[PDB]
Amino acid sequence: FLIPLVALGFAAANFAAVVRKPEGTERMKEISSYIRSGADSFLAHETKAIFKVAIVIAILLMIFTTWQTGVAFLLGAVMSASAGIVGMKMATRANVRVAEAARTTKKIGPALKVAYQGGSVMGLSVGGFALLGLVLVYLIFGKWMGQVDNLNIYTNWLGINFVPFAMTVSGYALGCSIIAMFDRVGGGVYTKAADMAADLVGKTELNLPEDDPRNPATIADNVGDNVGDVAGLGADLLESFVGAIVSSIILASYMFPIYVHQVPKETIQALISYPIFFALVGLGCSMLGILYVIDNPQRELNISLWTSALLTVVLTAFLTYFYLKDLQGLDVLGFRFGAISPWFSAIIGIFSGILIGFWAEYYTSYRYKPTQFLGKSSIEGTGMVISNGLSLGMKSVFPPTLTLVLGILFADYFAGLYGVAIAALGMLSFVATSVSVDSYGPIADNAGGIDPEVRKITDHLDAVGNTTAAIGKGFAIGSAIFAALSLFASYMFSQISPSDIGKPPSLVLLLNMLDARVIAGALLGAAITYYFSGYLISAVTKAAMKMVDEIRRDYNRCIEITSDNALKQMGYPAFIAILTPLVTGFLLGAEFVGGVLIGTVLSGAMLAILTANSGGAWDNAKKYLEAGNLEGYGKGSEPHKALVIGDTVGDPLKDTVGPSLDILIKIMSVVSVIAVSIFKHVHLF
Amino acid sequence: YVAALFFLIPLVALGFAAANFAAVVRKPEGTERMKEISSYIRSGADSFLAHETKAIFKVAIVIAILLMIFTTWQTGVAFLLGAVMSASAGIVGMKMATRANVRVAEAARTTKKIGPALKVAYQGGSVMGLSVGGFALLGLVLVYLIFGKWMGQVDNLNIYTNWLGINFVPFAMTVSGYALGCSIIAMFDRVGGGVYTKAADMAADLVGKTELNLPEDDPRNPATIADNVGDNVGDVAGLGADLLESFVGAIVSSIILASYMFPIYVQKIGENLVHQVPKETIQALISYPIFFALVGLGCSMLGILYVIVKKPSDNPQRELNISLWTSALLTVVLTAFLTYFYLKDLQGLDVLGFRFGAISPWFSAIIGIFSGILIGFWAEYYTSYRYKPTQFLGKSSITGMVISNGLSLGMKSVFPPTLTLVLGILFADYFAGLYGVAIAALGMLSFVATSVSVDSYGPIADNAGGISEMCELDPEVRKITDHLDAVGNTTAAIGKGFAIGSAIFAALSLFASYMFSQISPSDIGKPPSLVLLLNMLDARVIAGALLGAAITYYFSGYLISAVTKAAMKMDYNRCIEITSDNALKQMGYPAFIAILTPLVTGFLLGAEFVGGVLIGTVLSGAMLAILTANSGGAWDNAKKYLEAGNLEGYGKGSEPHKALVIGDTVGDPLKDTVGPSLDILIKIMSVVSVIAVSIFKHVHLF
Ligand SMILES: [Mg+2]
Ligand SMILES: [Mg+2]
Ligand SMILES: [Mg+2]
Numbered sequence A: 001f002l003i004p005l006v007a008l009g010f011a012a013a014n015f016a017a018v019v020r021k022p023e024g025t026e027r028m029k030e031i032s033s034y035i036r037s038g039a040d041s042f043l044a045h046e047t048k049a050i051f052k053v054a055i056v057i058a059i060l061l062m063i064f065t066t067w068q069t070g071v072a073f074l075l076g077a078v079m080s081a082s083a084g085i086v087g088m089k090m091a092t093r094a095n096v097r098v099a100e101a102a103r104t105t106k107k108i109g110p111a112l113k114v115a116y117q118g119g120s121v122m123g124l125s126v127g128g129f130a131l132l133g134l135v136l137v138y139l140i141f142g143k144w145m146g147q148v149d150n151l152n153i154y155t156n157w158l159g160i161n162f163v164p165f166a167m168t169v170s171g172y173a174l175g176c177s178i179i180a181m182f183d184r185v186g187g188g189v190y191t192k193a194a195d196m197a198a199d200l201v202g203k204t205e206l207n208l209p210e211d212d213p214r215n216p217a218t219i220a221d222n223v224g225d226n227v228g229d230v231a232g233l234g235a236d237l238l239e240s241f242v243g244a245i246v247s248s249i250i251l252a253s254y255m256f257p258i259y260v261h262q263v264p265k266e267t268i269q270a271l272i273s274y275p276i277f278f279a280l281v282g283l284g285c286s287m288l289g290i291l292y293v294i295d296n297p298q299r300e301l302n303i304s305l306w307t308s309a310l311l312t313v314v315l316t317a318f319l320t321y322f323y324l325k326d327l328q329g330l331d332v333l334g335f336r337f338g339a340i341s342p343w344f345s346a347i348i349g350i351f352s353g354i355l356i357g358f359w360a361e362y363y364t365s366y367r368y369k370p371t372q373f374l375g376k377s378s379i380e381g382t383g384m385v386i387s388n389g390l391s392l393g394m395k396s397v398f399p400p401t402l403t404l405v406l407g408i409l410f411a412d413y414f415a416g417l418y419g420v421a422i423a424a425l426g427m428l429s430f431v432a433t434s435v436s437v438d439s440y441g442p443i444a445d446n447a448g449g450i451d452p453e454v455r456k457i458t459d460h461l462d463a464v465g466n467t468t469a470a471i472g473k474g475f476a477i478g479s480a481i482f483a484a485l486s487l488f489a490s491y492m493f494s495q496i497s498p499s500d501i502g503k504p505p506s507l508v509l510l511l512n513m514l515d516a517r518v519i520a521g522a523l524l525g526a527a528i529t530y531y532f533s534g535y536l537i538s539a540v541t542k543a544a545m546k547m548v549d550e551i552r553r554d555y556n557r558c559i560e561i562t563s564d565n566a567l568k569q570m571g572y573p574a575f576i577a578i579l580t581p582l583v584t585g586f587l588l589g590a591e592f593v594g595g596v597l598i599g600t601v602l603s604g605a606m607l608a609i610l611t612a613n614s615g616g617a618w619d620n621a622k623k624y625l626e627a628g629n630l631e632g633y634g635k636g637s638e639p640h641k642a643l644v645i646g647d648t649v650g651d652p653l654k655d656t657v658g659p660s661l662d663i664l665i666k667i668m669s670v671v672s673v674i675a676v677s678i679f680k681h682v683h684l685f
Numbered sequence B: 001y002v003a004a005l006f007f008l009i010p011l012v013a014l015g016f017a018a019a020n021f022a023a024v025v026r027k028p029e030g031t032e033r034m035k036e037i038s039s040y041i042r043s044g045a046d047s048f049l050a051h052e053t054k055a056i057f058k059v060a061i062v063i064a065i066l067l068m069i070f071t072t073w074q075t076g077v078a079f080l081l082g083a084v085m086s087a088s089a090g091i092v093g094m095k096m097a098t099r100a101n102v103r104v105a106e107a108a109r110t111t112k113k114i115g116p117a118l119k120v121a122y123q124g125g126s127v128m129g130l131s132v133g134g135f136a137l138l139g140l141v142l143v144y145l146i147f148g149k150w151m152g153q154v155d156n157l158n159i160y161t162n163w164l165g166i167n168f169v170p171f172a173m174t175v176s177g178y179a180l181g182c183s184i185i186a187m188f189d190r191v192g193g194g195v196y197t198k199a200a201d202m203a204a205d206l207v208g209k210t211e212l213n214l215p216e217d218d219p220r221n222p223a224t225i226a227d228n229v230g231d232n233v234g235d236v237a238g239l240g241a242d243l244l245e246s247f248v249g250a251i252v253s254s255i256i257l258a259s260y261m262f263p264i265y266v267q268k269i270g271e272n273l274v275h276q277v278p279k280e281t282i283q284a285l286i287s288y289p290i291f292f293a294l295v296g297l298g299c300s301m302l303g304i305l306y307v308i309v310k311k312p313s314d315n316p317q318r319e320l321n322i323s324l325w326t327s328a329l330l331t332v333v334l335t336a337f338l339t340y341f342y343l344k345d346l347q348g349l350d351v352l353g354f355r356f357g358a359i360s361p362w363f364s365a366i367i368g369i370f371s372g373i374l375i376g377f378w379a380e381y382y383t384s385y386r387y388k389p390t391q392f393l394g395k396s397s398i399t400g401m402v403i404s405n406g407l408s409l410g411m412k413s414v415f416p417p418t419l420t421l422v423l424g425i426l427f428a429d430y431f432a433g434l435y436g437v438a439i440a441a442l443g444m445l446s447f448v449a450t451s452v453s454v455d456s457y458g459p460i461a462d463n464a465g466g467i468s469e470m471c472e473l474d475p476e477v478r479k480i481t482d483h484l485d486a487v488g489n490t491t492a493a494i495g496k497g498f499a500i501g502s503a504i505f506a507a508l509s510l511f512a513s514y515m516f517s518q519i520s521p522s523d524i525g526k527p528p529s530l531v532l533l534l535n536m537l538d539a540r541v542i543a544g545a546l547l548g549a550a551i552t553y554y555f556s557g558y559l560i561s562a563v564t565k566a567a568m569k570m571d572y573n574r575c576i577e578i579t580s581d582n583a584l585k586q587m588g589y590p591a592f593i594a595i596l597t598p599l600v601t602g603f604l605l606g607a608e609f610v611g612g613v614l615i616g617t618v619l620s621g622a623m624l625a626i627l628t629a630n631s632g633g634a635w636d637n638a639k640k641y642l643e644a645g646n647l648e649g650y651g652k653g654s655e656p657h658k659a660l661v662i663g664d665t666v667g668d669p670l671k672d673t674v675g676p677s678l679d680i681l682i683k684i685m686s687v688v689s690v691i692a693v694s695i696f697k698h699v700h701l702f
């Protein structure tokens, strides 16, 4: 209860504590000033865009559905934006202090503590704002208006029949989705255009030094390392977390009228509240793990993760047993082992998540065989390097997907679709620690950008941050896959109609693949996924060229130009993501859109895994060859040329395309779930 | 009866192919070193063919015996027949191209008959296409005449249950085995051949980047002879194998849909299920795809011969379009006549969903035909720099940016053909339900004879380009054949698009067939609408979709890994044979995985999971195929433009030219092995799933 406020205050306390850390060096202070100025300008531009789009969409939701939906949309927008702003400011401020600690104390410990404190500020802001928004929505709308009390399908002034509370939580999830969409897409385009331009100025005719303070592109690359790995990745994790919670709530809410009432109101109310309490326990357990951690940084991060996971396991076992022991109609909704069944699913998801990270690591890291084969092959041709990286990513897609399939099967066997959503929530129970670790990465990147012994210590922490960022990217992709699957489940429950309640519940819960509509929608969704990825790449290249032209021709000016180009190019993919469900449905019904959702989820998950793993393998092979474990091949060799080309191709892919894809899948699912009440029946063909 | 005339049409196609073979035999072939080179290529290719043919004969005999064990022996016999017919078509086309390669260059150079040499090369492609179509339809008609009519498998038309719990229609299972045979042979051909051809092209570029400096597509490299052997193996044989595989899949799926529609439509009156559709109507709907295919073959032959003797279009691509358009329109009109007669003899139109009666499947057919044409157009529009696409590729060439833009261009090109195909699906459904969806599938490849003709023309032009580069009589001598090679690359992309569109329609019909095979006598008592149900909500189905998409990407990646390993590894003829044998050995594994995945996934999780696996495989394979084909074609077409130097006089020596060559060599394995292997994967997985459903829907562990 009010645990999110504790997270917000504890995040603010770590902000105040780290501000009291000396900034030391003057050149480093100036670099942090440049990064802060550029990041704040980018914030101003994106916040103007987000304000306009969010107000428009909130008014639209208020028009077509109940006003509570639009209010929750705005609330989610505000909460996610606040979390992102607080975390990004923390990260921009903490890098120089981390460097100062590492330099003065000649030790990695104080620097590690300050960097992890900044990461914790970001993660705590995420969790606290998200869960505080959830609690405010529940307290204001569910109880004061009695939407949960009557728990009846409402018909608004446009003749749209729908569940008010489900539509409101759908709008709140849509707000999280819109914030994550703008953050990840625009920011990632910025981040990879900036890193690409930083590498390009090294290779231009003017030979402006790469990773140079006078280079505007190095400052843009640092700002992007912050914006991408913090705002976009944390936004993705919060979007998947909120999607899972909202999916559980929607599943219970629509199971109430479907099972006829075969399930009492008390059971439905408890199943709606269970993810909320389960989410709160995850936040508390995550903070406990963080507090314990605050010579091996990876060991400390792993300890934080495992403590958070195990504490969640035990406390949620107790909560789930004590709270769901007193409900009726558990078997009808799929609780095989009774009240213990959802908790089981949750822990399963937890394990799935951790395992997924390993697989990402197993393919992305150069310590293991996959990236060693890539580095060894690099002696034989740039094209062969590109082919081997593509093959490695395509091979890497399989093991995490197999893990996800096994987790889905186990969660289903335990507790139906409700426990599938609970397993998603279990995977995201330690999302606070996940966001903290992930936002650690870019602080280390910036510190690296900022004695040879202190340099090597900063390099050590930067490499640890890179590895953790790759692991977090894999984790985010897996969590987004679970969230999209649960959102599809919620959409298909939303397929319910007043005429359908008389029909068998199994007959209602029905999407035949044999339908040409379903098959064609799956095809179209997969095609739109690939077309989205292609236009992402084109936009990134265009933005990089525009920045290079401006540089040839004011660091804030160049950042503003890049931000404006990214925002202008973001409209078309955002338009596609928003309009595909609406247009496809108002033309063909809801079965076509369900097929679209299935195909989009499949294609986006697969491409995201592929791109993330390939880029991670390429970057780690670069580091492998630089450290020289491939004996007899020094810097400047043909393998280095091949790896540089491979990284320039892959880095933008792994850091914007795949995350954009999983944001795409989740937002398309959310928009379909929201619009179903209209466009199931208002369809042209 | 007139059926004798229909049976004679494939025989006429075979005879005309033999006549064109006699035409190519009259090759002067003045050049001696190039003739010896082609003889060496023929010897190596035939040795590889003998080795792979022995291995695939072993595997095919094993699989046929397995079919005889688990299901009817007619299934294995039809599988063996399809193996023989497809192998014969591939061999005939290969011999035709190998004989024609030197002849085209000889005519164009010595006799200055560049145009006539082009015409004879397209005639060789037509020989391959006629062999493909004639052998496929001859096998189909022999199967139908022997088993459906003589043995009374259609006459009794009753579901039989053998041991192991397999319930099935004997004739439907026989045609399923014949389609599975075409799929297995096409798999062995394409996977290994594509690995070999792209390893050979990559190895030629490696000799460019070895201690020597003799690159790929390069006259100075004699290692390119292995690349030429590949230009035949796969770039000729595999396109016909894939198109025949999709063609047979569409026809067999239509036949299965019609055959299982007979027991499905039953109405419970007085505790007795009355067959809602008569036997005569079902038999007519089973025979109709065969007559439509025969009419399509006849129209294709008429159009091809008419174009050869009517007008020498100065644009070879325009001439190919003229041939395609004539064949398409003739097929449309004659199928109008056929379907009007069937509508005159049909009465169960509303119960089966025929809005316009038998004309509605005809509509669907036309839809598919036009759809295919449009798809091809789109392919060109994105792969060729005639419009802004691939022009921006050259602008980017003006290296990492180039690679990124090529990837983006391929992914952009994915969307329009898929949108056109979705519109075609919607229209075919609206006309005539799933039966007309299958009819549109068959319509798209109704002119598959002309399609294979054009596509197999392509690599003959590629070989002529290599020979012209070797001759070095003039850069214009090289460029005349490079023009034809670029046309061939565009046609290969068009053929891949046709194959994937037909595969998508056929896979839709195969989902229908899978759920039809789910029928049991209890399901016959149960409502057909309730039976026809594969819920997406189901965790099994959704997880299966995820797994199928993952297997699609992992298959592509392991293909790339095997090709790269072969390139890393490499008597020069002995070395080529060793590389080819290693490629076949590594081809063995993914095929085994593809065959075993449906069986294992089902015996673990039911039939819903396997249906989901099929869904995911269809989606991912189709999308990747479109992507790879378009991207590779765009890269190669931009190469041609920069080589001619119309890009501001940069010339060969420009560093961006080297970067673009490297990018094109990267793209080649994708466009020439990944996507077509994926669509064959999709259809073979669907076929084996539909076969195994009868057991493993109810004999499942979890
Ligand atoms: Mg070549
Ligand atoms: Mg060549
Ligand atoms: Mg060639």
Ligand SMILES: [Mg+2]
Residues within 6 Å of the ligand: B201, B668, B669, B672
């Ligand atoms: Mg090639």
